Amino acid sequence: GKELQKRSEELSRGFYELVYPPVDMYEEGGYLVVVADLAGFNKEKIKARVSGQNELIIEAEREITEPGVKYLTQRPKYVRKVIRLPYNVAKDAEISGKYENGVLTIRIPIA
């Protein structure tokens, strides 16, 4: 909040590492759907799990090597977003996950 007054150069990977990825969460068809903008990761590095009964944890790691003169560095190397779900997830719940066009879509059965 009100880091909006900074200019783009002053916003670092660290800032985006706090707030990324942006997320949409909705229910349709007796399914909890969590949609995330997580561009540019390897799907075998994206680690999502529900800890407890309430918390989706989205973790992801990527290597960023940009040789030359730096000017802007905003894209996160690491991500660790914690989202509290409005639904109790069964331990044996069959959760699907897809990574397409940089978007992670997680479907959680509730009904």
Partner: peptide, 5 residues
């Protein structure tokens, strides 16, 4: 860990 398809 959720299987990302």
């Amino acid at each position: 860990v959720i299987k990302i398809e």
